[PDB]
Design a protein around this ligand. Structure first.
Ligand code: ATP
Ligand code: MG
Lengths: 432, 111, 123, 62, 62
């Protein structure tokens, strides 16, 4: 044994403990973490194998925990971690006792703030709209037009605005605009080719008026006395207005449409910052952050996951840049954890599970430079996008029984001598 | 007067149309089996005779083949000077440090 | 476009007909009359009215990106746009003085992962 | 197409203007004045002139 | 009453339309492999037992 000790303990640069050996438990196993964490990782296995109870061990060791005893009580050290939990399992591991002073952020359906004016077009079209329609084109065009008008109005100081510039804009005003357009009536008299109101007045700029409230258009009658015709966009927007009224009325989405702050007021543009430091832990000074998704609907998961990953990548980028102006690099490293990837990272799917992929794919490639690393978890790699697994460097594995997975794996792993591809199905519970 | 110096670590995914044009070859420690198979298939002189050597190559040892040399052969490089570096981050060290402060506003200014 | 006698031309919101666009459109955007069935002032929509929105959006988006200023707004040392009379100065930042052996390095970590093959093929 | 003033349309060989293609073309073929550069009879080709030859040959062939 | 006689040492660059007509062939040592492939794609009486000598040939043999 002495030899084995002299090897696995005293010949390494950056010791990170991992456990013990499968032969001699009176021995420890240590590796170089500078390379283990500074790159992309992957974990796999099958049911009842003990994955989560190992991930948790790893993280507890990282932040400096052992036996429910925070070693760094006096000082909170540097570590920044974000978890995408679903089954709501990890909140228990870090739920230490108040006597240990391990602050922890914790979110998920009721203390979350994630508004609708931080997206791009794709996400908006996906949420508010469908595409089973012929005249969808003109409808969507009017939608975008009204959106841009509302942005410009609420934020006049700037320029070069589009359907994608992230800045405040209301929605109820948009709906009011569309209703007035769907009840519009134009006059058809000499010098009256313009919307005719109940007070028999000609409107100059729809955008000036429509957004405030509804109006009272006169009958679209071609009677020469009051020759008038129906608005060219009248009685053509019912389905859309109805779906919108419905969506907004839903009470499971007030964390998104009406996200009120602690004061009880509505959010605005000047609060774009505080929205972020919660995803990180710089609002309560916690090294960890968790995202519960069980208590969330079934249609809008990928959207959220993309928004979040995007807003993390961007922070990392800009901060590393400001820091590099000084001739240095980022000292605020970040780790991300993505579980049950086979759900929102399919190997093959329609548009539903599109966004996430990009927002994640990006990280897989460039994150290593700006201080952003991943950790993937799954049990069905054969249903994940090879694009991603291709990029990870270190791998870990537990008991595997299915064959399509044995094969797909052996197709990848570098140091897989033939003597080991046969062990997997004969692995115990807790051995890796 | 135009020539290539292709490099890789997972050939079987590269377009064979290209590997089917290089004259000289060099290789180092190669553990995965699919790659051994592909390579072996490319070259007759590298039959089962020597292809069985790759996975047992030390660090700084290589195997060469082609028309340029005198015969298929093995070699041992020496460290170059000055070495190349990448200047990457070290998570494990920046985490045993304290806890930091940030001027988020400054960052938004650029954003 | 107008739909009356002698109105087989695109009609302008100013109640004017267009002769040729190859001289007009590149200048700026223009206003057009309403599409009315009024026999007195009738008008209709062109064949490409309401079909180019997404294509327009993608460009208005990309052109804004600053990570591509080296590709859409490249400027010389004087701080001016390039013309068709500097084709050589470009090549020369790869080769550099046939004599006095040269070396050239390129770093792609900074470039996005959507234009890489294009860059490579061009060079 | 006549390049003259207010004549941004095709001009029949008998010097008549074109209002509705869909009412004329299907009926039969038509002949137009030459695309003479003369300022008096200034006229250029159409945007699609001298391209529908093999696609018109194959049909009468079949 | 006319013939030909081709020579080369980099055949992979030559046109196949012509090599597809010669009847008798000769060869000497070939080290590169691209050639070997191109060659073996043509010759009419090349048993596999002969396709291996090409790089093993001495000086002056053919
Ligand atoms: N070191 C260990 N030794 C023995 N048993 C262990 C060890 N670690 C975990 N286990 C057992 O593993 C079980 C936990 O399994 P786990 O939840 O990790 O499976 P899983 O990977 O989540 O599978 P699935 O995702 O299909 O639910 C526990 O019931 C525990 O008894
Ligand atoms: Mg688990």
């Amino acid at each position: 044994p002495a030899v084995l000790e002299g090897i696995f303990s005293h010949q390494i640069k950056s010791p990170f403990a991992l456990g013990t050996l499968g032969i001699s438990p009176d021995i420890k196993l240590k590796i170089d973490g500078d390379r283990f964490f500074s790159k992309h990782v992957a974990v796999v296995g099958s049911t009842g194998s003990g994955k989560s109870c190992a991930v948790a061990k790893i993280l507890q060791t990282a932040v400096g925990i052992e036996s429910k005893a925070n070693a760094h009580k006096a000082a909170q050290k540097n570590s920044h971690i974000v978890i995408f939990d679903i089954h709501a399992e990890y909140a228990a591991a870090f739920n230490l006792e108040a006597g240990e002073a391990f602050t922890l952020n914790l979110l998920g359906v009721d203390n979350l703030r994630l508004p609708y004016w931080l997206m791009n077009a794709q996400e908006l079209e996906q949420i508010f709209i469908e595409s089973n329609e012929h005249n969808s084109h003109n409808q969507i065009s009017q939608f975008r037009h009204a959106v841009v008008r509302n942005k410009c109005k609420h934020n006049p100081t700037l320029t070069n605005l589009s359907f994608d510039t992230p800045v405040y804009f209301s929605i109820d005003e948009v709906v009011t605009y569309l209703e007035n357009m769907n009840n519009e009536v134009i006059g058809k008299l000499a010098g009256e080719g313009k919307p005719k109101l109940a007070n028999e007045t000609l409107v100059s700029d729809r955008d000036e008026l429509y957004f405030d409230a509804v109006q009272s258009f006169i009958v679209a009658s071609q009677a020469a006395a009051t020759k008038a015709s129906n608005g060219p966009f009248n009685g053509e927007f019912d389905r859309m207005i109805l779906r919108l009224h419905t969506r907004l009325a839903d009470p499971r989405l007030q964390f998104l449409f009406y996200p009120k702050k602690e004061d009880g007021e509505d959010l605005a543009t000047g609060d774009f910052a505080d929205v972020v430091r919660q995803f990180v832990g710089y609002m309560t000074k916690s090294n960890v952050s968790i995202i519960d998704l069980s208590g969330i609907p079934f249609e809008v998961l990928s959207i959220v996951v993309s928004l979040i990953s995007r807003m993390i990548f961007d922070f990392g980028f800009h901060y590393s840049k400001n820091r590099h102006v000084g001739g240095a690099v980022s000292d605020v490293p970040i780790l991300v954890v993505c579980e049950e990837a086979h759900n929102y990272l399919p190997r093959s799917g329609g548009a539903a599970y599109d966004a996430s992929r990009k927002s994640i794919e990006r990280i897989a490639k460039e994150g290593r430079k700006y201080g952003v690393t991943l950790m993937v978890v799954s049990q069905r790699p054969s249903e994940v996008s090879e694009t991603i697994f291709s990029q990870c460097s270190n791998f870990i594995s537990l008991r595997l029984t299915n064959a399509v997975d044995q094969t797909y794996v052996k197709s990848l792993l570098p140091d897989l001598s033939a003597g080991l591809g046969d062990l997997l199905p004969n692995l115990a519970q807790g051995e890796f | 007067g135009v020539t290539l110096m292709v490099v890789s670590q997972r050939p079987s995914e590269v377009s064979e149309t290209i590997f089917s044009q290089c004259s000289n070859f060099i290789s180092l420690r190669l553990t995965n089996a699919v790659d051994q198979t592909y390579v072996k298939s490319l070259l007759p002189d590298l039959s089962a005779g020597l292809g069985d050597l790759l996975p047992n190559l030390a660090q700084g040892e290589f195997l060469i083949v082609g028309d340029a040399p005198l015969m298929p052969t093995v070699g041992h490089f020496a460290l170059p000077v000055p070495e190349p570096h990448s200047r990457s981050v070290n998570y494990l060290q920046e985490w045993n440090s304290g806890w930091r402060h940030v001027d988020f506003d400054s960052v938004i200014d650029r954003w």
